[PDB]
Amino acid sequence: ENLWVTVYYGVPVWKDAETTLFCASDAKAYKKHNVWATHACVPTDPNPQEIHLENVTEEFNMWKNNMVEQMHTDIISLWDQSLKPCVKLTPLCVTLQCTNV
Amino acid sequence: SVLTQSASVSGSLGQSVTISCTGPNSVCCSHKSISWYQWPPGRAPTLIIYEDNERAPGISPRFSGYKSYWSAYLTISDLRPEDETTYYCCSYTHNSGCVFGTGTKVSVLGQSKANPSVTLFPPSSEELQANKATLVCLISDFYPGAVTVAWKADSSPVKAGVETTTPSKQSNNKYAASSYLSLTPEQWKSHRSYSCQVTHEGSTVEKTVAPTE
Amino acid sequence: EGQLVQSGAELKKPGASVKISCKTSGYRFNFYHINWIRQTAGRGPEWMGWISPYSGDKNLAPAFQDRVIMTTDTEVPVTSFTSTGAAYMEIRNLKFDDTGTYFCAKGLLRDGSSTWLPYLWGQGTLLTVSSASTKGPSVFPLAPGGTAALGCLVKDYFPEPVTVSWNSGALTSGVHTFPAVLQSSGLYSLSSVVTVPSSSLGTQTYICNVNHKPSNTKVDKRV
Amino acid sequence: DSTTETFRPSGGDMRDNWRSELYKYKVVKIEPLGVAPTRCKRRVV
Amino acid sequence: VFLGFLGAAGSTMGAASMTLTVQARNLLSLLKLTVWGIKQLQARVLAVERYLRDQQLLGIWGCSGKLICCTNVPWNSSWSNRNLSEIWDNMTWLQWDKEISNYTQIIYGLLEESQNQQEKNEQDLLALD
Amino acid sequence: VFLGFLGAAGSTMGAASMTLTVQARNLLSLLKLTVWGIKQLQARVLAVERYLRDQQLLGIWGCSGKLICCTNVPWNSSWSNRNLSEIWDNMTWLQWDKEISNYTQIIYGLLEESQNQQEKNEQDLLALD
Ligand SMILES: *[C@@H]1O[C@H](CO)[C@@H](O[C@@H]2O[C@H](CO)[C@@H](O[C@@H]3O[C@H](CO[C@H]4O[C@H](CO[C@H]5O[C@H](CO)[C@@H](O)[C@H](O)[C@@H]5O)[C@@H](O)[C@H](O[C@H]5O[C@H](CO)[C@@H](O)[C@H](O)[C@@H]5O)[C@@H]4O)[C@@H](O)[C@H](O[C@H]4O[C@H](CO)[C@@H](O)[C@H](O)[C@@H]4O)[C@@H]3O)[C@H](O)[C@H]2NC(C)=O)[C@H](O)[C@H]1NC(C)=O
Ligand SMILES: *[C@@H]1O[C@H](CO)[C@@H](O[C@@H]2O[C@H](CO)[C@@H](O[C@@H]3O[C@H](CO)[C@@H](O)[C@H](O)[C@@H]3O)[C@H](O)[C@H]2NC(C)=O)[C@H](O)[C@H]1NC(C)=O
Ligand SMILES: *[C@@H]1O[C@H](CO)[C@@H](O)[C@H](O)[C@H]1NC(C)=O
Ligand SMILES: *[C@@H]1O[C@H](CO)[C@@H](O)[C@H](O)[C@H]1NC(C)=O
């Protein structure tokens, strides 16, 4: 009848949070340097583990999802990273005299 | 049912009372768990005790359980007016459904007396047209819960068309009952008065109606 | 902290079948057994069986093993920890001694030595088994410290039950409804009375609303 | 007056393309520290 | 019987308390200036930072080595009034953490002070002779 | 009675030894290439690096779980000649650390060798039967 608090380390408890995710893609080999795969994305594990959570019911909201906002800024930032070293056509703004084909 | 309870038990106000629950060894005690339920007639029951001592959530500490090898017991301490009702025990295991007991009616002694309320209604003009006639005698807020009703036609007993209900418990832990007297319109109009007499061991009350007024 | 609401009372002839429903809310329907218990005057309270909404395992008492069919629907989620559901019991080969009150009940714990133990009960469903036909009631007015009493008389109806309200449920204080009488003919009759101040004749109109769903009849009588 | 409904395509935002594949996913953090009451007590020794 | 990481998240607290090892394992395990490299390195530092914080709390509660540890703090009923069967056989750790998330900070403070800060001084005065 | 982080820095060693939990808690807890981001991330890695080093020493001294641990190393008088009352009721941890900072490295070496490297082999030979 005398109750006491006891600490448990490893209880299946989670809370909604937004963190910094990273990239992971299979080991595709090759021409290359495709903007998204980049020089190095963590290669996907040879076998992924999908663990079904029985009895669990979670609330979802694809419209307030922060994964979308992160992916958006990742595509944009990846684009600029690939344009920086390429040739800039500042002198190509010379006056053009064009005729039909 | 093979699970027998005490048919009746009584305890005084502010006191305690114990209900028993026993039966054959096939359906009793060891190798079995016992639960207790409060079950007022005409209403949904309430679980008070499960797995022996351990009482259901929110149950007052006034309730306690105890199980011997041959029988189980339920103890109600600090008796209240609301504790006066019917109680059932159950024998069960984890994989086997309930076996209900024979039932126990608990009476709480040492309670204050309640004066009977008697009301008699005559037949409606729409009812005399039908043409029938039924007198309705309603009784409420009396204690203890037992009445006897007698009808009279011009101060003389009636025996044809008398119907009386059993006593029933009110929400305020008093009791109520009703009685109906069916008559033909001739008997109703051919008498000077009709009477409903409600008799209690401490006091008899009489209510009278008359076709004249 | 959830409520179980069962289907309304029904009158059926002996030999027929009837299906009672039990809709749940306020808790995870999948996590608790649904028990079915009945109470008759001849046998008292009698446990019939339970069924698990999660696994579908059912356990029926031998007395109802051959006449009771228990089924459940899939839970409709509301929040992460609550949902709504529905359980059904179909009883066939009805007899006169099967007339009584039937209850569905939610189990006690998800795990332990008494998981299925009926803990949360519904309001009950009244089942009448009889060869007699349904009969609607006849409602009559009950003519009326400075206090008085008035009401409405419900005479000769079948079967049970009959519900009475006042002013479409606006009047609940001072209402006193009496149990029904069992006439020698086999028909029931009850009365309902309300206590009001005698001075309130110029400001209050009392309407008694009688509903007898077995006959699908409503009566609104002005006292 | 709700008599007829018209539907036109559009491309207001580029994020809607990502939501078409991230509708099923969600990020949560694991909090593995739980405190509960039991009939256990530490030994004073 | 293993279901996997967070498999018992919908089970009763008693059932989930049996597979705490499962959550314990998967709880920690020319220019590299790519957007992925900065994200990865910052993600790795975030993972070890959260792990060391929980292990820090277990340290100051004298429960470093164990997944289940008992304390001296009595269970104040204002936190939860539920009995043992109702807690461990009727609730999940999720809805439990929601019911007690309110008093968690107070409980953590009593957990570090009441025992291990008192226990260590009394341990020195006891083994003093 | 709590004064806060480092509150007992000017108190006697005995008084400060009572609130070691206070120092233990607050001891660990398009382009992100900003000067602040590089400083922050490098600062966070520095904090966990110092914490893990002290916890490493407690580990190799067999004192991982505790804030107060007793050892087998006897106190060589050449380090300090002061009696217990003079040390614990007349000195602060600051001026103590200054008086013994000279022999700290030697003491740390004896602390990892003398007991826990001897204790573990003798523990196996004792529980060997
Ligand atoms: C997700 O949530 C759900 C719901 O919350 C949860 O499901 C509950 O899980 C708990 C624990 O696992 C269950 O509680 C246990 O139930 C055990 C099963 O009950 C037995 O009895 C049934 C009736 O048997 C009679 O009838 C048959 C004819 O049908 C007859 O032949 C028999 O002889 C007997 O007379 C039976 O149908 C049932 O069978 C199922 O289970 C077995 C596995 O055991 C399976 O192989 C079958 O195919 C079938 O699916 C079963 O045999 C019960 O044994 C158990 O009691 C023992 O264990 C407890 C410890 O838990 C001991 O304390 C106790 O003393 C006993 O030794 C306990 O009662 C509960 O019933 C489930 N359903 C609910 C709560 O609705 C999931 O587990 C959750 N999962 C996750 C991952 O979170
Ligand atoms: C776009 O305009 C340019 C002019 O600036 C066109 O280039 C010229 O196209 C003509 C064809 O009409 C070429 O004529 C050929 O020249 C070669 C020279 O080796 C000769 O061998 C052939 O017999 C013929 O005369 C001309 O050479 C060429 N001029 C240059 C500088 O390349 C071009 O064709 C136009 N393209 C389109 C799609 O309009
Ligand atoms: C949690 O705590 C807040 C603030 O005291 C209170 O308003 C809320 O009702 C609580 N909810 C819980 C613990 O269920
Ligand atoms: C510390 O050690 C150095 C080198 O042995 C010595 O010169 C100095 O006097 C000492 N100071 C102390 C410990 O007070």
Q: Out of A10, A13, A72, whose CB is closest to D14?
A: A72
Q: How many residues are present in chain A?
A: 101
CB count within 10 Å of CB B5 equals 24
DSSP, residue by residue, B64-130: EEEE-SSEEEEEE-S--GGG-SEEEEEEE-SSS--EE---EEEEEESPPPB--EEEEEPPPHHHHTT
**Can you list the domains of chain C with their CATH numbers?**
1-131 (2.60.40.10), 132-223 (2.60.40.10)
Beta-bridge mates of residue D38: A4
- C103-120 burial string, b = 16+ CB within 10 Å, else e? bbbbbbbbebebbbbbbb
Using DSSP's 3-state secondary structure scheme, residue B21 falls into: strand
Round to whole Å and give the CA distance between B128 and C69: 49
Amino acid at F106: I
Tokens 């009475």 belong to residue: C164
CATH class of B111-211: mainly beta
Residues 44-103 of B with CB under 8 A from E: 51, 54, 57
Angle between helices E35-60 and F35-60 (to 10 degrees): 40
Of all protein residues, the one whose alpha carbon is nearest to atom 12 of ligand 4 is F99
Cα Rg, chain C, nearest whole Å: 21
On the question of a common fold for B1-110 and B111-211, the answer reads: yes
From the CA of A97, which ligand is nearest? 2
CB count within 10 Å of CB C68 equals 18
Task: List CB contacts (< 8 A) between D26 and chain E.
Answer: none
Residue E37 near residue E55 (C-beta atoms within 8 A): no
DSSP, residue by residue, chain E: ----TTGGGGS-HHHHGGGHHHHHHTTT------HHHHHHHHHHHHHHHHHHHHHHHHHHTT-TT-SEEEEEEE--TTT----HHHHHTT--HHHHHHHHTTTHHHHHHHHIIIIIIHHHHHHHHHTT-
Q: Out of B42, B88, B180, whose CB is closest to C189?
A: B180
Round to whole Å and give the CA distance between F113 and F129: 25
Task: List CB contacts (< 8 A) between A59 and chain C.
Answer: 79-80
Round to whole Å and give the CA distance between E56 and C73: 48
Min Cα distance D1 → chain A (Å) is 29
Ligand 1 mutation target, pool B93, B95, B98, B99, most atoms within 8 A of CB: B95
- Domain B1-110: CATH architecture, name and number where available: Sandwich (2.60)
Tokens 């009488």 belong to residue: C181
Q: Where are the domains of chain B?
A: 1-110, 111-211
Q: What are phi and psi of B126, to 5 degrees?
A: -65, -30
Residue B193 near residue B154 (C-beta atoms within 8 A): yes
Method: X-ray
Round to whole Å and give the CA distance between C221 and C151: 10
